[PDB]
Amino acid sequence: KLTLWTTLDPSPNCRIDVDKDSKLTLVLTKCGSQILANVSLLVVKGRFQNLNYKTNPNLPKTFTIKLLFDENGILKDSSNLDKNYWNYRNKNAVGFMPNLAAYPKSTTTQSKLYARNTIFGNIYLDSQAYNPVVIKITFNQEADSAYSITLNYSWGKDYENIPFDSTSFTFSYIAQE
Amino acid sequence: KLTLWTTLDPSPNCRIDVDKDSKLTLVLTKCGSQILANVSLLVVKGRFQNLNYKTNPNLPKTFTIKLLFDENGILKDSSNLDKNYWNYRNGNSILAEQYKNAVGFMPNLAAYPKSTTTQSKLYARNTIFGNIYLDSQAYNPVVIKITFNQEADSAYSITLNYSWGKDYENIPFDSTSFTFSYIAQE
Amino acid sequence: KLTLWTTLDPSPNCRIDVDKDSKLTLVLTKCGSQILANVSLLVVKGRFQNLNYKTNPNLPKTFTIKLLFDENGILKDSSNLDKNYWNYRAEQYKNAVGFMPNLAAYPKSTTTQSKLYARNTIFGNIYLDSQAYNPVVIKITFNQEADSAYSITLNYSWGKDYENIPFDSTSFTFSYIAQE
Ligand SMILES: CC(=O)N[C@H]1[C@H]([C@H](O)[C@H](O)CO)O[C@](O)(C(=O)O)C[C@@H]1O
Ligand SMILES: CC(=O)N[C@H]1[C@H]([C@H](O)[C@H](O)CO)O[C@](O)(C(=O)O)C[C@@H]1O
Ligand SMILES: CC(=O)N[C@H]1[C@H]([C@H](O)[C@H](O)CO)O[C@](O)(C(=O)O)C[C@@H]1O
Numbered sequence: 001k002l003t004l005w006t007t008l009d010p011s012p013n014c015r016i017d018v019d020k021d022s023k024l025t026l027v028l029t030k031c032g033s034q035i036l037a038n039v040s041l042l043v044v045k046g047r048f049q050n051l052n053y054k055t056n057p058n059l060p061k062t063f064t065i066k067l068l069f070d071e072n073g074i075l076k077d078s079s080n081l082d083k084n085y086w087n088y089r090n091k092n093a094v095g096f097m098p099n100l101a102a103y104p105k106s107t108t109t110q111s112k113l114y115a116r117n118t119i120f121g122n123i124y125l126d127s128q129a130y131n132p133v134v135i136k137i138t139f140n141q142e143a144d145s146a147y148s149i150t151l152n153y154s155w156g157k158d159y160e161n162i163p164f165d166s167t168s169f170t171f172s173y174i175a176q177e
Numbered sequence: 178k179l180t181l182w183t184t185l186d187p188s189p190n191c192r193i194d195v196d197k198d199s200k201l202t203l204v205l206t207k208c209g210s211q212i213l214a215n216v217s218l219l220v221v222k223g224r225f226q227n228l229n230y231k232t233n234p235n236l237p238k239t240f241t242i243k244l245l246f247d248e249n250g251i252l253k254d255s256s257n258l259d260k261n262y263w264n265y266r267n268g269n270s271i272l273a274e275q276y277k278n279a280v281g282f283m284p285n286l287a288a289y290p291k292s293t294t295t296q297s298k299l300y301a302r303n304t305i306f307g308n309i310y311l312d313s314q315a316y317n318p319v320v321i322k323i324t325f326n327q328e329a330d331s332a333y334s335i336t337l338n339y340s341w342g343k344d345y346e347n348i349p350f351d352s353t354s355f356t357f358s359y360i361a362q363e
Numbered sequence: 364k365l366t367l368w369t370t371l372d373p374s375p376n377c378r379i380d381v382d383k384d385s386k387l388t389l390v391l392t393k394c395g396s397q398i399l400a401n402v403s404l405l406v407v408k409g410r411f412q413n414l415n416y417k418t419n420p421n422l423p424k425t426f427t428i429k430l431l432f433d434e435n436g437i438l439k440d441s442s443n444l445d446k447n448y449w450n451y452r453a454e455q456y457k458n459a460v461g462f463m464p465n466l467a468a469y470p471k472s473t474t475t476q477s478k479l480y481a482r483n484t485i486f487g488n489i490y491l492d493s494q495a496y497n498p499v500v501i502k503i504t505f506n507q508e509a510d511s512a513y514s515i516t517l518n519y520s521w522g523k524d525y526e527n528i529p530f531d532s533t534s535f536t537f538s539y540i541a542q543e
Contacts, residue, residue: 032207
């Protein structure tokens, strides 16, 4: 009842460009009014599996994984994460949603959120300190969802045959209730 | 699982230089012997609202927000944070009765000793460093230095020191969120 | 919300090169299926107490502290941390599998390969002597050690030619997925 997560099942569970090109491990543990979050990401196939900017000049240095939730905190099909790999550990989940007062949605006109809607972290590819990636977590940015967690990954380095196999990052956010 | 926080009320609640020039969002959630802390800061007016080191050569690149607590973990008036915006959680605002004991939320004095007469130099473990960012951009870093029990005329203290190196040009001091934990007094 | 930790007792409790050359402060607090961890490290004697790369050219810029656990989550004598300074918040405990890093989330290296998944690892920036300009990289790796059911490996490394800087680290918070 306490923890909402992606099962630890080894099989791919996430779409960046293409169905099942990635495995997201996301654990949301409710500790009162804060959610303790833990995230890692492995790309298993497609253009981001093996980064080589020396050989592929058209390769982006960013992708975005979105978790979209309805008014009851149910994950929506339009999410990048496959609905079938998201459940409580061994139903309503508003206690796990990012607080709308703390993290307001952008009025249609604006598009500009407060800064507090966002968390930045440094994560690393292939367990090496010298393969940094910036993870940008943004709450309630997506307009056609009551709640959202957006995971933006970006990097600067001209990586040469580095697998997108990320280290683990911990963060917290204020819970809706 | 009791939580001690600044209400989420949009109104300013904090003094850097001047009454109500800033809005601190601080949430302290007690998970047993550790406090899970979450902090963001917006400057709403004054010299730090909009940073421009090209146009204002006299502008510091640091300020300090202090939360000072008495022996009972009550926030003191001398704190930078307005006492009226600080209480236990009961929605998206605070409980009615202003609180009586919060020692369970205070930074442990054994883990984070106050500086003995002999030395004003604390142990390093009294301090947490984090990188936060202005205006949701990775290229506007600010160093947040959180220090416990550094202030001498208080039983307990949380000191939030903000500093940066870049000659920012028209960047609003509107910070991203940072999570940390510390060992609780009880 | 049971907590497993090193007592806050001021006495040294850890071996980097030599018995009691360091004091590790590690607090593992169980919040359901995640462990909330808090760590600081002070070196009290030996070659790493005071870093000077101008005066000592043979000094490494890394050391590793290992916590090794058996199938019941009991800390083993072969650990760098002294067994006597590790208990619930002194008659040693009996089961702590609820505090161990999950074997499904953080698999041990198959015989074939010593190469773990990246998710077994957490990187953090910590600082010596409470100064932003004395960075140290802490690399936390789970279940890397082959002769233990469970392990937490704390690798410390740095680049700067520090001149008379004490290895007195700031505090770092992380979490990991619990075995149960
Ligand atoms: C974990 C970490 O901070 N590693 C950093 C490494 C260093 O190898 C290390 O910090 C030295 O101790 O430098 C970078 O690659 C760099 O210069 O672009 C950034 C990267 O984030
Ligand atoms: C999250 C993070 O580490 N951000 C860092 C960024 C980005 O990494 C870089 O803009 C992408 O290439 O670099 C800095 O702006 C810089 O170089 O001065 C410092 C800042 O702390
Ligand atoms: C990010 C942080 O907290 N500390 C960083 C400091 C300070 O930002 C700087 O000394 C104050 O201006 O800069 C470095 O030493 C650097 O540029 O090589 C890296 C170090 O990680």
